[PDB]
Nucleic acid binder design. Structure first.
Ligand SMILES: [Zn+2]
Ligand SMILES: [Zn+2]
Ligand SMILES: [Zn+2]
Ligand SMILES: [Zn+2]
Lengths: 73, 70
DNA sequence: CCAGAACAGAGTGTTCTG
DNA sequence: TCAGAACACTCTGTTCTG
């Protein structure tokens, strides 16, 4: 029955900012939208985002967050 | 004057290849240490001063292909 | 100069709270 | 229920040292 993060496939802690996610992707999304970051993809803007590689490309991670419908209101 | 790994300003010839300091210490730490680097793209990730943190796997790959060794 | 050590920061992830 | 605070850890890069 266990719930899965729609961003990285890790265990989802709950519905955060409109989307079923884990804590890491939650706080990441908050920090990313509000914070001033220089995220730039090194691939083709389609990087695989899972528990191991989510640290690799913050750009694609934020992209998946936004496309999932995450918002702060 | 330019790092053959990320194109940043090269500090000198390290481990056999003209590199900067960051790629020097990165290479040593990567080779000796037990890391779980995994590429999220297609093994052709752009490694420059801005994005070199993104894919350690491809960075290490460029180091090895450059001939770096201990 | 070059190798290695050591110090410091960015980014991240978990725990705790209401 | 979920949002936010805050501490702690990993990885990295510069400075220091032999
Ligand atoms: Zn997640
Ligand atoms: Zn990417
Ligand atoms: Zn370099
Ligand atoms: Zn890569």
């Amino acid at each position: 029955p266990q719930k899965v993060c729609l961003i990285c496939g890790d265990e989802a802690s709950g519905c955060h900012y409109g989307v079923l996610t884990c804590g890491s992707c939650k706080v990441f999304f908050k920090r990313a939208v509000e914070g001033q970051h220089n995220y730039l993809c090194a691939g083709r803007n389609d990087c695989i985002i899972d528990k191991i590689r989510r640290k690799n490309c913050p750009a694609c991670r934020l992209r998946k967050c936004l496309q999932a419908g995450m918002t702060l209101g």
